[PDB]
Structures are given as structure tokens and as C-alpha cells.
């Protein structure tokens, strides 16, 4: 829920590089279940132990992304100059995206997984850096 | 905002009314003047100056209705500002009086190229 972000955005802020990537693989790990549930429902019946959706590798993929997605940041947060920055957290975009690039082979997916993920990476921490609010009221 | 479910209430008497030769009322029905020409053009007329009795009563329609429509448009802005200025008039703590300061107070940036 929102309190996961209230333990993500609150305590670490670059340092403590194990609990950063322990919590940031929970969210991205959880969304592998959501893409699994429609891939057994909107797609027809799979093998004997549903969910066995067609190609598999769904929750195998999603939790692996959030496993490194703190780890690429929290290493590179402290080792350079010790803030958290938009250029700091940019680094977790590309190689964080390249998990989907590593599997289901590249040269047409992987660099495109690298490029666009780096666009949407830095804007998130940029969001609270300017105080951006998506779902607001007057 | 009271006196519910009227097309336009009783209290719209002291509004001007929006008298004619205003360009909207010329324009309302000018599109109807265009619409009656379309009304021939759909049906392989093949005139484009067809029966005037079909080409009239479009002009009569939009102008009458559009006039009777605009009497509440000018009402609704008139009732809009009427309630704002009252809430401006009460509660002066939400509406302070700013100080008048000329250009002897400000030291702005200063950024030249």
C-alpha cells in the first residue's frame, strides 16, 4: 500500500543499501502477480497447475528488476559525492531495464528497454524534488 | 442561487436586456442560414436556391431561441459576481490592503548577458 512508500521514501535516502533493495523488490515483485493473474484469465487455460501462463517467466522477471533497482542507486548514491540526485538515480534506469533486455534477447528490445526506462527513472525522484503531486485537490 | 428549477428566474428583470444587433445574434442563425442551404444540398435538390419556405423558418428558429437562451447567460455571470463581492465585503482578514511601493524599493536580479 502507500505505507510501503512511507518506508521506502522515508528512512534510507541513498544509504543502507540492503534495506533499500529489500523493500524496492517488494513493489516490483508484487506487480508480477498482477500481470500473472490476467495472463491466466484473459488468456485461455494453461497447463495443469494454473497459473502456468504460456511462456512463463513473469514473476521470474518482475522481482528481479526491483532487486537491482535500489542496488544500482544505493551503491552509486554514496560512493560518488553523497547526495541523492537526478543524475544519481538516472543510473538505475538503463541496467535496471536491461533485466528485460537480458532475457527475451536484445538488439531491438534491450536498448529500447534501456533508453525509455532511463527517461522514466529520474523523473520520479525529481517529482518530490520539486514537490510534484499527481492526484491533488484544491 | 435560490428559487430552484426555473429556466430563468424572476430576479433577472434588472439586466439590460441583451438587445438586438449584437453580432452573436447575427451569427446565431447565420449558421442556420448556412444550414438551410445544406438542407437542399443533401437531397439532390439540385437548386441551391430552392424553396424559400424551407430556406426560411430556419432563420426564425435560431434567432428567437438564441435570444431567449442568452437572457440567462448574462444572468449567470451577474449572479456570479454578485456573490463574490459580498464575500469580498465580509471577512477583511482574507483580503488585506497591499502597500504601495514605487521603484525605489526593489533590487531585482540583476542578470545581463
Amino acid at each position: 500500500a502507500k505505507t510501503v512508500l512511507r518506508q521506502y521514501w522515508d528512512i534510507p535516502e541513498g544509504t543502507e543499501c540492503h534495506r533499500k533493495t529489500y523493500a524496492t523488490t517488494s513493489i516490483g515483485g508484487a506487480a508480477g502477480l498482477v500481470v500473472s493473474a490476467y495472463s491466466v484469465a484473459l488468456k485461455t487455460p494453461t497447463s495443469f497447475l494454473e497459473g502456468v501462463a504460456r511462456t512463463g517467466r513473469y514473476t521470474f522477471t518482475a522481482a528481479a528488476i526491483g532487486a537491482i533497482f535500489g542496488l544500482t542507486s544505493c551503491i552509486s548514491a554514496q560512493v560518488r559525492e553523497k547526495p541523492d540526485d537526478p543524475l544519481n538515480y538516472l543510473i538505475g534506469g538503463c541496467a535496471g531495464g536491461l533485466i528485460l533486455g537480458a532475457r527475451t534477447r536484445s538488439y531491438g528490445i534491450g536498448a529500447a528497454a534501456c533508453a525509455y526506462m532511463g527517461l522514466t527513472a529520474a523523473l520520479v525522484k525529481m517529482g518530490q524534488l520539486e514537490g510534484w503531486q499527481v492526484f491533488a485537490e484544491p | 442561487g435560490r428559487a430552484t428549477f426555473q429556466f430563468l428566474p424572476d430576479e433577472a428583470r434588472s439586466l439590460p436586456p441583451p438587445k438586438l444587433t449584437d453580432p452573436r445574434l447575427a451569427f446565431v442563425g447565420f449558421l442556420g442560414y448556412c444550414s438551410g442551404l445544406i438542407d437542399n444540398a443533401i437531397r439532390r435538390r439540385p437548386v441551391l436556391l430552392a424553396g424559400l419556405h424551407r430556406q426560411l423558418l430556419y432563420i426564425t428558429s435560431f434567432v428567437f431561441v438564441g435570444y431567449y437562451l442568452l437572457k440567462r447567460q448574462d444572468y449567470m455571470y451577474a449572479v456570479r459576481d454578485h456573490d463574490m463581492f459580498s464575500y469580498i465585503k465580509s471577512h477583511p482578514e482574507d483580503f488585506p490592503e497591499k502597500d504601495k511601493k514605487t521603484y525605489g524599493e526593489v533590487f531585482e536580479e540583476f542578470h545581463p548577458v
Partner: protein
């Protein structure tokens, strides 16, 4: 048959008045109960075995979408016992309310209510009557409005145009192309409803006009996009110019008046320091235009009128109230300084 066809047709709009004229949750239950009773004959008229296997896919989707509503009433019957149509006093009720009613208006979840019905009903004639069922629950969300969770009503609406957009680029059947972009134009209005719930009705009155005038143009012969080729040089070349004008108007281009809603609706969506919310949707309805371009690339460029068949006779259908539709659905953008002070 002729007189009883009116009495069925008359009570459809009598079902939806009681939805609006009500201070009591029991009467709004009856209101669009009998609409789900009095649509089922109109589905039938020529008795074809797709139509019977389409209304039954229509039916039980609007039986459950009925049935969860009465569940939502009896929960806040227990809490404070007032039955006026107002805020629902319980977050377990309002959550069950809004995503029950999201099936009758169908949003992006509760998906295939919209294409699977409207496709292949042999009554393509109208089926303009699917504008009342978009009009009854919107008259219910005007009152319930100050009791929602503000995340669910946007998440059904952010998904609305992102999946009503993609769904129809893979189509030919122009009833589905009208069935699609009918979820999209339900995406723009309920993204706004928490913020100033009028300037929602502006989008709806525009949506009734531009969609009703689309079906009346279609009632010469038109079934498929390939059939939309073979009437420029055969039926009337003025029809090809007209069918261009409304589509380019319904895409939202600023020389016409389908740009009238958005232009005004972003005046409300920002002014509430919400900027990343409209910039997503405003760039999303752009590939809602690649339906319409690539549809206009069929009829307006003389694309192969073959199979020589002459219509040497005139046309006598009833194009009722057609002469005044593309004169308020195109040319009104200058003439509306305040349409949102009549409707307000």
C-alpha cells in the same frame, strides 16, 4: 406491432426520468431496472441468431451491474438510515458503488460490454438508443460526487482512453469503430468529475450531438470500411464532404468544435495544480485520431469505386433532424463564450 413499438420506446426515457426525479434509493433502483427490461425487445426485431446470442451477452452483464447497486444501498441502510441521494457515509459502500456502476457506462475494466453487443446486431439503424444508458448513471454521479476515493475514479479513467484507444486500430467494422472511441469519450468526462463536476455535462451534450449525427450519415447502406468507399461516386459526393467534416470535428481540431470541451476542460484540470494528469491524456487522444485519419483516407480520395452498379434513382430515407446537426457540431466554437453558464 406499430403502436406497441412506441410504448416500448416511450418507457425507455420514462425509466430514466425516475432516476433523475428521486430523493430515495429505492426509486433509483426501479429507474434503471425497467430500462434493462425495456431494451431487450429492441435488440430482437428481425430475429437473427447473432442478435439472440448478443442480447443475452448484453443481459446478464446488466443484471449483476444492477444487483451490486442494491447491495450498496442496504449497507448504508445500516449506517444512519437516511435514504436521500447524497454521500454514502461508508467507504465500503462507495467503493462497491462506483465500480458497480462502472459496468453500465462501461469503463476500461468491465471491458467487452461495448464491442460484443454493438457489433453484429442486425439493427444497426439505431442503437442510437445506447445514448440513454450513458445518460442515466451520469445523472447518478452528479449527487454521489462528494463521496469517492479519488483514486478509483481516476484509475478507471486513466485506463479508459489508454485501452479504448489501442483497441480499435485493429478494426474494419465501423460499428466497432463507433463502439470504440465511446469508452474514450467516457474517459475525458470522469477524469474531471472530482474537480468541479459541472463542465462535465459540457462534454456529454457535445458527445450526444456528434455521435447521433454520425449514425444518421451511416444510414444509406454503410456496413464496412470497404463499403464506405463505394458511395462517393455513386450515392452523393456531398456525403463524402460531410462525413469528412464531422470526423475531423470529433477528433478535436481547433478550427472545429470538438476542440470546445478540452480547451475548457483543461482550464479546470489545471488551476488545480495537476499538470501531469492532463498531459498524459491530452497526448493519449492523439492516437484516437488515427482511427479517423485512415478512415478519411478511404472515402475522400476516390479509392477504387469498382463493380459498376448504378443508382439511377433518388433516395427516400428519413434523415430526421440532420440538417441542423453539422451546423452546431462544427461551427459553434466561436458562439460558445458561455455554454457553461446556461448549463451551470
Amino acid at each position: 406491432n406499430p403502436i406497441i413499438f412506441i410504448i416500448i420506446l416511450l418507457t425507455i426515457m420514462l425509466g430514466t426520468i425516475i432516476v433523475m426525479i428521486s430523493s430515495h434509493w429505492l426509486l433509483v433502483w426501479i429507474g434503471f431496472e425497467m430500462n434493462m427490461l425495456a431494451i431487450i425487445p429492441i435488440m430482437m426485431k428481425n430475429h437473427n441468431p447473432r442478435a439472440t446470442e448478443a442480447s443475452t451477452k448484453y443481459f446478464l452483464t446488466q443484471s449483476t451491474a444492477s444487483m451490486l447497486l442494491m447491495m450498496a444501498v442496504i449497507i448504508n441502510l445500516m449506517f444512519s438510515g437516511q435514504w436521500t441521494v447524497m454521500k454514502l457515509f461508508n467507504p465500503m459502500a462507495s467503493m462497491l458503488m462506483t465500480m458497480a456502476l462502472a459496468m453500465k457506462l462501461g469503463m476500461a475494466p468491465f471491458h467487452f460490454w461495448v464491442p460484443e453487443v454493438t457489433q453484429g446486431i442486425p439493427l444497426s439503424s439505431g442503437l442510437i438508443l445506447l445514448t440513454w444508458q450513458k445518460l442515466a448513471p451520469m445523472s447518478v454521479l452528479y449527487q454521489i460526487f462528494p463521496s469517492i476515493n479519488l483514486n478509483l475514479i481516476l484509475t478507471l479513467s486513466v485506463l479508459s482512453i489508454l485501452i479504448g484507444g489501442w483497441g480499435g486500430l485493429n478494426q474494419t467494422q465501423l460499428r466497432k469503430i463507433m463502439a470504440y472511441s465511446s469508452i474514450a469519450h467516457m474517459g475525458w468526462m470522469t477524469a474531471v468529475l472530482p474537480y468541479n463536476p459541472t463542465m462535465t455535462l459540457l462534454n456529454l451534450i457535445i458527445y450526444i450531438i456528434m455521435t447521433s449525427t454520425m449514425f444518421t450519415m451511416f444510414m444509406a447502406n454503410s456496413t464496412t470500411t470497404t463499403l464506405s468507399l463505394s458511395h462517393t461516386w455513386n450515392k452523393t459526393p456531398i456525403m463524402t464532404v460531410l462525413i469528412l467534416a464531422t470526423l475531423l470535428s470529433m477528433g478535436g481540431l481547433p478550427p472545429l468544435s470538438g476542440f470546445m470541451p478540452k480547451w475548457m476542460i483543461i482550464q479546470e484540470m489545471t488551476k488545480n495544480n495537476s499538470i501531469i494528469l492532463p498531459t498524459f491524456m491530452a497526448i493519449t487522444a492523439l492516437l484516437n485520431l488515427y482511427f479517423y485519419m485512415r478512415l478519411t483516407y478511404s472515402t475522400t480520395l476516390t479509392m477504387f469505386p469498382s463493380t459498376n452498379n448504378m443508382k439511377m434513382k433518388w433516395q427516400f430515407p428519413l434523415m430526421k433532424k440532420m440538417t441542423f446537426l453539422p451546423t452546431m457540431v462544427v461551427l459553434s466554437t466561436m458562439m460558445l463564450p458561455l455554454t457553461p453558464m446556461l448549463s451551470v
